[PDB]
Amino acid sequence: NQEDSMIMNQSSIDRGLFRSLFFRSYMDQEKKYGMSITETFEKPQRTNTLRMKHGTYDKLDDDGLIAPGVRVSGEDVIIGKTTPISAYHSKRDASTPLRSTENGIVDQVLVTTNQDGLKFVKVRVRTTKIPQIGDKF
Amino acid sequence: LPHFSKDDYSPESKGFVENSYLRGLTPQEFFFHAMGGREGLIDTAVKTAETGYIQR
Amino acid sequence: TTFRFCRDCNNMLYPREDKENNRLLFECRTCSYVEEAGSPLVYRHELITNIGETAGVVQDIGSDPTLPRSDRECPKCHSRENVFFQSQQRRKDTSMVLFFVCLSCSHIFTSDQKNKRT
Amino acid sequence: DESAPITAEDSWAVISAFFREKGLVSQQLDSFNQFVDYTLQDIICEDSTLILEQLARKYEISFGKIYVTKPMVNESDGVTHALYPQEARLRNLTYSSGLFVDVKKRTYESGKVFIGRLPIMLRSKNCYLSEATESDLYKLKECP
Amino acid sequence: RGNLMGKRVDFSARTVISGDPNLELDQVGVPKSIAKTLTYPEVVTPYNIDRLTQLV
Amino acid sequence: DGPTMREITETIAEAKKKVLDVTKEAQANLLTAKHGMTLRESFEDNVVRFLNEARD
Amino acid sequence: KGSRFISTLQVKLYGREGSSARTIKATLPYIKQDIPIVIIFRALGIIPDGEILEHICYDVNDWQMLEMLKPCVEDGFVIQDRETALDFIGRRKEKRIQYAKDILQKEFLPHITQLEGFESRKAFFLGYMINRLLLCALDRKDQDDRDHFGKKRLDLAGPLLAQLFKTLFKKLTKDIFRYMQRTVEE
Amino acid sequence: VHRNPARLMETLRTLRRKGDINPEVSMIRDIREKELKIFTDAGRVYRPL
Amino acid sequence: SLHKMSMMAHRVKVIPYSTFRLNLSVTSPYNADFDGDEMNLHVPQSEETRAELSQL
Amino acid sequence: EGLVEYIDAEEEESILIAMQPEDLEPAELDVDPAKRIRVSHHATTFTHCEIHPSMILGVAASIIPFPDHNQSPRNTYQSAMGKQAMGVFLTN
Amino acid sequence: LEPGHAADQEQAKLIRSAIEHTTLKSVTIASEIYYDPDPRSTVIPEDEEIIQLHFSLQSPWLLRLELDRAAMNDKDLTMGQVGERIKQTFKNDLFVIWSE
Amino acid sequence: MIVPVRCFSCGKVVGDKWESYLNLLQEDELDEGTALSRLGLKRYCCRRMILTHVDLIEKFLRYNP
RNA sequence: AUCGAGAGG
DNA sequence: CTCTCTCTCGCTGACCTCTCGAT
DNA sequence: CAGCGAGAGAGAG
Ligand SMILES: [Mg+2]
Ligand SMILES: [Zn+2]
Ligand SMILES: [Zn+2]
Ligand SMILES: [Zn+2]
C-alpha cells in the first residue's frame, strides 16, 4: 500500500466488484468518389485487395460486416471495405482493424444511410474490465 | 466578502481561519482557503515552466 | 486657491500686478474686465493633503448597509448612531485613522487625538 | 405559523423548488431560447432591405418574420420526416431546424423561402424533447 | 531540438508503476509481455549456443 | 484533548485580543512607525506575525 | 445594435507625477495626435473655459482638480472657436472640419449615441472620464481592476451563435445582391 | 442625473419585486459615489438571494 | 528527468502482472509516487552500452 | 412575490448579506466544544441572506463529502478526478 | 558600521541621515505662491513676525513653504540647515529667510 | 444495475433478500435498519450491499426495444 | 497529416 | 557642434505520456 | 518582457 498504493481483496473482486463494461464503437462509411464510383462494403478478396491489413477476415461475414457475439482480439477485422483504384489488385483495403490492445465480444452492428446516402456501419464491441494491479482507484 | 462589513481589517475578514480541519470550516474560511489553494496550484504549474526554462 | 473667471464670458482670469500702487488684480483675456484680488495667493501646492479624508459625505451615507456602525458617539449633538470609515484617500502612505460621521446632525469626528483640523 | 421565520432546513426546500423550475443547465437553454425567439427577428430586421437603383428604378427586398421549423430532416431522395435526437446521433446527422423567412419583393419606380438549416439545442423549446413526457422520452430513447 | 537533440527510440517501453517490497532496490520488475516484446541482440558463442538454441 | 482544546481556543482568543488592541491603537493614530515603513505596513506585519505565532 | 467591433477612447495625463506641463489629452479614433481636452470640448461646442471645467468637474469646492485642469486651459486659450478646433484634426480646409464633425458623431462615444445634436451628453461623459483620471491622479480613488467579475461578461451559446448568424446572413444577402446585379433579366 | 435617489430606488426595487422591472436587470447605487448604474446587460452571472 | 538520478540502470526481473515494479526506496531519486505514475524503460543493444549502464 | 432577488456582482457590491437565517434573528454562554467556532456576524443591517452557503460550490465540489473539513487543493483534485470516475452515464 | 563601533545606535542614525537622500519635497507639507507688495510688510501675520525676528531685511512675489516638524526631527537636518541648503543651491539668484 | 448476489467482503448471498426487503419496508413502514436486521445481514458489509444498491434494471426495462 | 480540445503524472 | 549618453520601439525566445474531435 | 540594438536627439560638455 506504500506511496498511496492500495490492496484490494481478490475474493471481493471475484465477486463482481468495480467491474466495468467497456463499450467501444468503431464507425466507417462508404466513401463516394463521385462519377458513379463508390467504396464497397464486402469481405475483401485477397487478389482483388492490395496492402490488406495483417488480420483475420475469417470472423468477417460475406458482407464485410461482422456479427454480434463474435469474439475479436488483436488484429481481427471488424469492418471490411474495399476501395476501387483507377488491373490486378484493383481494390485497396479500407477494412478497419480492431485496436491491438482490446479483447472484445461484438455487442452490436448498426448499418444505416446518411443524409448524402452513403452507408454507415458502427460496430460496438463489449468487454468486461475487472480490477487489475495498477488500475487507478 | 459580501457578508463582512466594510473596512474590516479584523482577522476573520482578513482570512485567518481559527477552526481546525476536524472542527469544520465556516463558509468564509473555506472560500479564503480556496483562494490560497488556487494560488498554490497556479504557482505550481507556471513556476515549473519558469524553472525548467532556467534548467535548460 | 480660489479660481476666478470674468463674469461675462467665463474664460479664465489671469493675474496682473499694478506697479504704481503695488496691487494684484485678475484680468480676463477675452474681455478687458479686471477685478481686485481678495486673497493674495496666486497658487497653492500641497505636497501632503488631508483633503479627501471625508469624501462625498451625504445624509444618505447613513443609510448604506455596507458601511459599519460604531460604538462611539459624537460630542456635538451626542448622537449614538454613527458610521465609521477608513480614510477615502488611497495613498502609498496612509493613516489608519477612522473617520466617524454622525447619522444625525452631520458631525464628522476624526478618531485621531493629535489633529482636530476640519 | 406562516409568520414564523425559516430555518436552515427550510432553505433546502427553496433550493429544491428552484431546481425543479429551472434545472441544472437552465442557463444554456434560456440563452438559446431567447436567441431563437427574439434574436433571429432582430438579425433579419437589421439590414433587412437591400436595394439597387437606376433611374434612367429601385429593387427592394424586405424580410418578414423568420419561421423555425420543429427540427426535422429530409433524407436525400426521401420525404421530409421528423428528426429525433437519438436517431440523429445514431445517424451521424446534424440535429437541424428549417429557417424560412417571409420575403416581400417590391420594385420601386413570394411564399416562404428557406434561408437555412440551424442546429437546435436539445431541451430547447423548439426541440421536441422539452414538450415530451418521461414515458415519451423512454419511447424516444433519450434518457429521462 | 525535436529530432536531433531528442529522438523517439526503438527498444523503449513504459508502464504504470507500483512498488514491490520483496524486489531488490537495484532490480526492476518488468511485465512478461514487455520482456517478450523487447529484444537484445546477442552474438552466438560456444558458451551461449545451447542456451540460445533452447530460447529460440 | 478537551483541556488542550480549550487552551488552543484561549490562545486564539489572546492573539485576537492583541490584534484588536493594535487595531485600536492604529485607529487612535498613537502609533510608532518603523523608519522607511508605512504605518499600515507595520500594522500588517504585527497582525500577520501574531496570527502565525498563535497557530504555531 | 451597431457594429460589434470596438472603438477605444483613451484620455491620458502627460508628464511624470512630479512635473510641469501636465496635460490631459485624449486620442480620437482616427487622429494621429492626441488632442487636448479643451480642443475636443470646443469642437463639441462647449466653448467657455469655465463651462469646460464645469463639465469636467462637478464640485465647485475642490481646488486641486481645477489647478491640474488649468494648464490644459492654457492650451485651450489658443483655440477659442469650434471651427478651429475641428480644423486642427487629423492629417492630410472645411473638408478637415467636416471630417472632424463626422468623427465626433460616430467614432467618439458611439455607445451613448451616434446621432447629431447629442454632443453635450458626449461632452459630459468625457468630463466624467477626465474626473475619474484626476481622482486616480489625486490618489483619492484607486485604479480600477480588470479582475472584477461584474466587469467580466460570459457569452453563452446563444450570443455566440448570433454573431455567426448575422455574419452568415450578411454574406447570403450579399450573395443574393450579386445575383441581382449580375442579371437584369431574371 | 436625479435627485432624491433613495425614493426612486425604493420604487425601482418594488417594481422588480412586482416584476414590471425585469428580475434579471441589475441596478446599483453607491451613495458616496453619488452614482447609479442600471444594467439590462446580458452575460452577467447573478445569484439568487 | 531533472537528474542523472532520474535515469538509472536496473537489473531485469520478469514479473507476472502488468505494472513495472520498483523498490520503495528507489522512488525518492526518481520522484516516483505509486499512484498512477508512469515510468519508462530503455534496453541497451550493445555489450559496450550494457557495460556503460552497469558500470556507471 | 418579491421574497427572493437576483444579484449581479456589481449589485452584490452595494448589498450586505448573511450566510445563515439564524444570524439575522436577534441574539441577546455555554456551547458544545466540538462545533466549529463561528464569529458572530457583528453586523447590524442585512439587505439579503444567502439561500445556503453550500451553493457556492460547483457540482463536482457538491459531490465531495466534507470539503469544509479538508484542504481545498484536495477538493480541486477530486473535482477533476470524479469526471474520470466510472459510473452509469445514462439509462439509454 | 565603522570598525570598533558597535552599540552606536546614534552613530548608525548619523550614518543613515548622511546616506539617505533627503529632499525639500520629503519635508515640505505645502508650497504656496503668495503676492507680498512690500518686502518689509507681509500679508501673512506669521511672516510679519519672522520679519520682526530679523532686524536686517527683488520681487513682490513670495514663495511660502510649510514643512512638517516630525519629518524634520526624524531627519538630522535643522530648519536653519534646510534653509541654508536652499540658499547655496540658489547662488543668491533667490533670497531665502528661514523661521527658527 | 441489479441486486448483487453476494456481499463482496464475505460472499454471503444477498440476492434472495432484496425483493422481500423492499416489501418489508413498504409493508410495515419499517425502517431500513430493522429490515436489514430481520434479513439477517448483521455485518455492515452485507448491510452495505443492499442499502447502497440502486436497481437500474427497471429504468432499462422501461425502454421498449 | 494538420489544427484544436481534453486528460495523466 | 557633437558625439554621447538618453531614449527609443523592436523579437524573442521561452518534461514526457494518453485519449478524442474535427479538417 | 526586457532588451540590447542600432537609430535618433537634444545636451552638457
Ligand atoms: Mg501517478
Ligand atoms: Zn471675459
Ligand atoms: Zn452629531
Ligand atoms: Zn458481508
Side-chain angles (χ1 to χ4, degrees), chain A residues 1-31 33-34 36 38-137, chain B, chain C residues 1-115 118, chain D residues 1-51 56 60-105 107 111-144, chain E, chain F, chain G residues 1-90 93-186, chain H, chain I, chain J residues 1-27 29-92, chain K residues 1-56 58-100, chain L:
Chain A
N1 37 40
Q2 303 213 3
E3 318 268 33
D4 289 41
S5 322
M6 60 191 51
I7 309 187
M8 203 176 340
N9 171 215
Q10 191 50 76
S11 307
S12 294
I13 292 186
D14 280 355
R15 302 165 274 246
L17 154 74
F18 269 127
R19 291 228 207 138
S20 57
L21 311 100
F22 166 47
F23 293 73
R24 174 108 63 176
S25 312
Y26 317 70
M27 180 227 79
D28 202 343
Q29 60 151 206
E30 297 255 275
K31 301 180 214 135
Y33 309 88
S36 301
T38 170
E39 283 192 351
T40 317
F41 266 130
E42 87 255 47
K43 176 126 148 191
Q45 198 65 53
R46 156 159 149 198
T47 49
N48 308 13
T49 43
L50 183 43
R51 262 290 171 210
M52 322 165 48
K53 342 301 180 184
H54 38 65
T56 73
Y57 301 93
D58 314 328
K59 285 141 201 271
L60 250 180
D61 295 20
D62 287 31
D63 64 339
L65 321 173
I66 209 174
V70 169
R71 283 198 123 141
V72 284
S73 204
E75 294 239 18
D76 300 335
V77 178
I78 47 185
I79 285 150
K81 177 142 64 34
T82 66
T83 78
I85 298 313
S86 306
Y88 173 60
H89 271 307
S90 78
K91 318 191 305 222
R92 147 159 310 131
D93 203 3
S95 298
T96 312
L98 183 95
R99 289 193 231 286
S100 307
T101 180
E102 278 104 308
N103 56 303
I105 289 110
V106 176
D107 212 38
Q108 283 109 4
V109 161
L110 202 162
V111 52
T112 200
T113 181
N114 82 268
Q115 73 213 10
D116 295 44
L118 302 163
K119 203 158 105 143
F120 260 82
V121 299
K122 276 128 196 149
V123 180
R124 209 169 65 195
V125 292
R126 163 181 41 102
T127 315
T128 286
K129 295 234 200 192
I130 318 163
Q132 190 210 107
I133 290 69
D135 280 352
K136 218 176 202 168
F137 287 77
Chain B
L1 281 188
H3 316 264
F4 284 132
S5 195
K6 262 194 169 103
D7 259 328
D8 208 359
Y9 285 62
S10 75
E12 325 78 340
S13 79
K14 294 321 290 313
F16 153 88
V17 173
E18 157 180 12
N19 293 287
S20 45
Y21 281 135
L22 178 161
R23 271 210 176 140
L25 268 73
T26 73
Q28 313 89 340
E29 286 167 329
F30 176 52
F31 195 93
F32 291 134
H33 194 343
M35 304 213 219
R38 181 78 57 91
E39 173 170 71
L41 317 180
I42 296 156
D43 185 2
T44 311
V46 76
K47 195 34 72 193
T48 56
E50 272 266 10
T51 320
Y53 192 17
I54 284 149
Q55 171 154 339
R56 195 226 172 165
Chain C
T1 304
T2 313
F3 201 18
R4 296 282 325 274
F5 320 97
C6 114
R7 159 55 195 82
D8 303 342
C9 83
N10 224 328
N11 282 226
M12 92 176 178
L13 287 184
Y14 283 63
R16 184 60 270 178
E17 181 217 19
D18 164 38
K19 314 93 182 173
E20 322 206 287
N21 307 13
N22 221 347
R23 280 172 343 108
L24 156 71
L25 71 174
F26 276 59
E27 51 165 10
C28 136
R29 312 261 181 141
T30 302
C31 326
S32 287
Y33 153 69
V34 197
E35 53 161 30
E36 45 201 302
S39 166
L41 179 91
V42 157
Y43 170 71
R44 175 182 168 84
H45 179 166
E46 296 189 12
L47 293 214
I48 294 105
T49 82
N50 305 29
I51 329 172
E53 57 192 30
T54 48
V57 180
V58 192
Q59 287 325 90
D60 318 330
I61 274 177
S63 94
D64 165 68
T66 68
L67 273 165
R69 275 152 192 54
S70 162
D71 41 8
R72 92 157 56 167
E73 88 81 11
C74 116
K76 147 78 200 80
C77 71
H78 276 337
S79 286
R80 198 45 74 211
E81 271 56 60
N82 74 97
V83 163
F84 64 108
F85 67 105
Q86 291 237 353
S87 147
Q88 315 280 247
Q89 165 168 29
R90 314 221 161 220
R91 195 158 146 67
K92 264 141 60 173
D93 41 296
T94 313
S95 85
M96 321 195 57
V97 163
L98 293 200
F99 294 81
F100 304 70
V101 179
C102 243
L103 292 206
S104 46
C105 113
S106 277
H107 182 210
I108 302 94
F109 45 113
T110 301
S111 69
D112 160 66
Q113 285 85 302
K114 303 204 160 114
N115 167 76
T118 84
Chain D
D1 169 77
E2 168 149 8
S3 86
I6 79 165
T7 81
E9 181 54 88
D10 306 48
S11 165
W12 284 108
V14 161
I15 313 188
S16 324
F18 162 85
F19 282 124
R20 322 152 80 202
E21 203 212 272
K22 311 235 159 170
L24 180 292
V25 290
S26 74
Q27 52 87 346
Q28 288 255 9
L29 313 160
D30 300 343
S31 153
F32 180 79
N33 288 357
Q34 188 284 329
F35 163 79
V36 168
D37 298 1
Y38 318 111
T39 303
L40 294 155
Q41 212 37 62
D42 314 341
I43 295 314
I44 190 50
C45 288
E46 292 146 50
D47 205 350
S48 94
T49 56
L50 68 171
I51 294 104
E60 70 154 339
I61 316 100
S62 57
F63 281 87
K65 52 162 44 211
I66 177 73
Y67 313 105
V68 168
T69 78
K70 277 262 210 173
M72 72 186 328
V73 288
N74 163 281
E75 296 284 25
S76 95
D77 315 328
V79 77
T80 314
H81 72 109
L83 170 68
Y84 280 76
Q86 204 42 265
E87 148 158 39
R89 284 166 288 208
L90 308 158
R91 269 297 222 299
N92 276 32
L93 265 49
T94 316
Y95 211 78
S96 165
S97 269
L99 269 41
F100 289 65
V101 283
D102 264 2
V103 174
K104 306 320 326 169
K105 144 192 161 63
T107 69
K112 343 192 176 292
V113 305
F114 147 69
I115 46 148
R117 324 221 71 200
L118 160 73
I120 300 307
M121 161 173 317
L122 262 78
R123 291 321 288 287
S124 153
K125 315 162 82 83
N126 172 246
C127 167
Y128 307 93
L129 301 189
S130 45
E131 283 87 310
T133 313
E134 152 171 62
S135 69
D136 304 356
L137 288 163
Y138 275 120
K139 295 191 262 142
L140 295 159
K141 286 142 191 262
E142 191 35 51
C143 175
Chain E
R1 273 196 74 185
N3 312 337
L4 281 156
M5 293 309 257
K7 297 169 148 185
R8 314 220 145 263
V9 279
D10 260 343
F11 307 98
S12 57
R14 163 200 200 100
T15 315
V16 165
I17 62 131
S18 63
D20 210 287
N22 307 101
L23 196 180
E24 298 277 307
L25 168 139
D26 42 359
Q27 299 217 121
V28 55
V30 190
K32 182 143 300 153
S33 61
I34 306 284
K36 285 157 28 161
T37 319
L38 293 151
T39 73
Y40 167 62
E42 167 160 318
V43 181
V44 296
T45 69
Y47 323 112
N48 68 29
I49 207 75
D50 314 332
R51 190 224 324 161
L52 294 201
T53 36
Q54 212 277 350
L55 307 175
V56 182
Chain F
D1 289 54
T4 313
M5 277 283 192
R6 315 148 40 77
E7 313 202 351
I8 287 144
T9 68
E10 243 162 58
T11 303
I12 297 307
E14 81 166 30
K16 285 188 84 186
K17 296 313 151 303
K18 305 325 259 191
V19 171
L20 75 85
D21 294 346
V22 186
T23 313
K24 264 302 301 203
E25 151 175 20
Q27 291 164 352
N29 199 4
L30 325 176
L31 213 169
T32 300
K34 274 63 201 163
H35 171 104
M37 264 285 289
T38 83
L39 203 43
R40 333 186 71 78
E41 269 169 354
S42 91
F43 179 65
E44 279 296 271
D45 324 311
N46 318 135
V47 183
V48 161
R49 208 190 79 249
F50 300 156
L51 304 185
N52 288 346
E53 285 151 345
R55 159 189 34 99
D56 315 329
Chain G
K1 307 140 171 90
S3 52
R4 180 50 81 189
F5 203 49
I6 303 205
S7 93
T8 312
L9 159 82
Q10 305 184 316
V11 186
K12 53 202 71 163
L13 157 67
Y14 290 65
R16 45 210 309 162
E17 316 83 11
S19 37
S20 75
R22 308 305 287 293
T23 60
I24 285 84
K25 293 173 90 180
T27 180
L28 282 194
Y30 292 174
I31 278 71
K32 143 173 170 62
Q33 318 211 19
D34 314 275
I35 48 173
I37 38 165
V38 291
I39 288 184
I40 322 172
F41 263 99
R42 256 65 157 281
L44 272 162
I46 292 78
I47 291 284
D49 295 7
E51 232 168 69
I52 296 155
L53 262 74
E54 174 141 35
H55 269 304
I56 293 172
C57 166
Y58 310 99
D59 165 57
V60 284
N61 313 326
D62 159 48
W63 46 295
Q64 296 146 127
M65 161 174 319
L66 320 177
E67 273 155 312
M68 315 189 34
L69 297 171
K70 306 182 317 194
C72 263
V73 196
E74 191 56 53
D75 318 67
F77 266 83
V78 196
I79 290 205
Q80 292 270 342
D81 70 86
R82 177 198 221 125
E83 155 270 312
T84 39
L86 305 150
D87 171 337
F88 174 47
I89 284 302
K93 333 310 169 284
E94 163 51 46
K95 52 183 101 182
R96 282 177 337 232
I97 287 79
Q98 196 41 79
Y99 191 28
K101 307 141 91 80
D102 318 316
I103 285 159
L104 260 291
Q105 317 135 5
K106 323 164 281 183
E107 275 48 53
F108 149 81
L109 265 67
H111 73 295
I112 310 287
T113 291
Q114 268 179 131
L115 71 85
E116 285 59 19
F118 261 32
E119 281 66 49
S120 99
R121 305 171 92 112
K122 288 188 170 177
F124 263 121
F125 196 83
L126 167 51
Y128 176 93
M129 295 191 60
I130 307 155
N131 163 67
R132 295 334 225 179
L133 180 74
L134 296 207
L135 296 142
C136 165
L138 291 203
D139 273 28
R140 185 192 324 261
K141 297 303 156 257
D142 223 342
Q143 41 178 354
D144 314 278
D145 84 14
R146 264 141 171 160
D147 300 359
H148 190 302
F149 206 29
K151 324 272 162 283
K152 311 313 297 265
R153 300 307 217 226
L154 266 162
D155 293 298
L156 272 203
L160 299 155
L161 299 177
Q163 153 214 38
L164 260 185
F165 179 43
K166 95 174 62 162
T167 305
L168 270 293
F169 204 50
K170 174 213 61 203
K171 186 203 141 43
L172 169 63
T173 54
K174 154 172 261 193
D175 279 44
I176 293 162
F177 219 57
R178 339 164 179 252
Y179 168 83
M180 267 164 29
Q181 316 324 305
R182 278 148 20 85
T183 61
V184 195
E185 322 96 310
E186 51 283 4
Chain H
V1 285
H2 182 51
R3 327 151 182 261
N4 202 206
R7 194 151 321 181
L8 170 141
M9 207 69 165
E10 182 96 325
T11 322
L12 292 192
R13 277 188 346 110
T14 46
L15 289 180
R16 165 194 282 169
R17 273 54 184 288
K18 155 193 182 323
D20 174 278
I21 281 191
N22 194 317
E24 154 192 287
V25 170
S26 92
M27 41 196 168
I28 310 105
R29 197 205 144 174
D30 177 20
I31 305 117
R32 322 215 299 246
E33 203 46 58
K34 288 271 299 303
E35 289 164 71
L36 181 125
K37 315 152 291 313
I38 314 160
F39 276 112
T40 57
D41 204 7
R44 324 152 301 170
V45 200
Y46 38 100
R47 53 212 310 260
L49 272 163
Chain I
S1 275
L2 322 157
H3 271 173
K4 53 149 51 173
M5 277 56 72
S6 324
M7 303 228 295
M8 257 183 319
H10 277 250
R11 274 203 339 269
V12 163
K13 155 83 170 283
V14 184
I15 47 153
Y17 297 75
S18 312
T19 57
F20 266 128
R21 304 301 271 226
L22 56 153
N23 197 358
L24 312 171
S25 285
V26 77
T27 60
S28 298
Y30 279 141
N31 205 352
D33 182 0
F34 284 162
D35 71 34
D37 293 45
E38 248 157 33
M39 296 205 35
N40 311 358
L41 188 146
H42 303 49
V43 172
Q45 304 307 105
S46 316
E47 261 294 349
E48 31 185 44
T49 296
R50 291 166 111 258
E52 294 189 334
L53 310 193
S54 46
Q55 284 336 279
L56 322 173
Chain J
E1 280 161 301
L3 301 157
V4 186
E5 210 180 25
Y6 283 170
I7 312 303
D8 181 20
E10 286 257 33
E11 182 146 329
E12 242 190 314
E13 280 204 291
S14 86
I15 78 185
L16 201 83
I17 55 180
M19 209 84 57
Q20 256 199 8
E22 301 69 26
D23 305 354
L24 266 153
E25 203 256 350
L29 321 183
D30 80 335
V31 68
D32 184 288
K35 328 203 183 324
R36 65 200 91 189
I37 300 316
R38 305 227 156 176
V39 66
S40 76
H41 270 286
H42 287 133
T44 166
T45 68
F46 284 121
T47 41
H48 321 113
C49 170
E50 293 250 58
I51 319 293
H52 200 274
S54 49
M55 303 287 110
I56 51 154
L57 280 176
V59 52
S62 324
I63 305 284
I64 291 142
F66 273 124
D68 43 3
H69 294 63
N70 274 7
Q71 213 189 329
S72 197
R74 294 291 151 201
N75 296 317
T76 291
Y77 292 130
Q78 155 67 28
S79 318
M81 285 188 337
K83 331 221 183 51
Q84 274 96 31
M86 275 166 5
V88 281
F89 97 84
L90 269 194
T91 65
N92 71 346
Chain K
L1 217 45
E2 88 163 306
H5 278 237
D8 254 339
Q9 317 56 57
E10 72 308 311
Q11 157 144 344
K13 278 144 208 234
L14 271 43
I15 295 321
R16 154 142 71 81
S17 315
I19 170 154
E20 230 160 33
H21 199 140
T22 307
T23 180
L24 201 43
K25 154 192 281 293
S26 77
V27 285
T28 301
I29 315 197
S31 165
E32 265 154 321
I33 308 284
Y34 275 99
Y35 164 84
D36 262 347
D38 176 42
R40 329 288 186 85
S41 77
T42 82
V43 305
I44 306 98
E46 302 95 284
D47 294 16
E48 296 265 31
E49 170 262 4
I50 314 275
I51 289 284
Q52 295 144 31
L53 298 166
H54 43 256
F55 84 101
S56 316
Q58 203 261 354
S59 149
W61 308 100
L62 163 75
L63 171 62
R64 215 166 153 270
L65 306 184
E66 159 73 277
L67 323 184
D68 172 333
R69 341 289 301 290
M72 283 271 330
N73 307 325
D74 163 14
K75 269 316 152 52
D76 173 271
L77 298 151
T78 82
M79 171 84 259
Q81 209 189 327
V82 171
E84 266 303 314
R85 284 289 309 107
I86 318 165
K87 214 153 182 273
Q88 68 278 59
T89 61
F90 273 162
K91 172 269 190 203
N92 221 336
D93 264 335
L94 206 150
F95 153 71
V96 185
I97 46 184
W98 30 97
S99 45
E100 320 171 52
Chain L
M1 335 195 80
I2 199 137
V3 197
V5 194
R6 306 145 166 269
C7 143
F8 311 155
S9 76
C10 322
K12 174 182 200 93
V13 289
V14 278
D16 49 307
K17 296 111 169 140
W18 169 268
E19 184 84 23
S20 281
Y21 155 67
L22 260 51
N23 281 274
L24 290 108
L25 70 73
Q26 138 74 48
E27 183 169 47
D28 320 66
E29 288 88 289
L30 262 184
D31 56 275
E32 293 88 354
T34 50
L36 295 201
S37 317
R38 298 313 304 144
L39 288 186
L41 322 172
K42 99 178 93 183
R43 319 189 278 287
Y44 40 88
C45 48
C46 315
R47 276 200 142 81
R48 102 182 90 104
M49 219 70 53
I50 306 284
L51 230 54
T52 55
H53 163 255
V54 185
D55 214 325
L56 312 177
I57 182 154
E58 337 286 340
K59 272 80 188 147
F60 301 146
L61 287 173
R62 303 283 292 308
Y63 289 92
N64 165 77

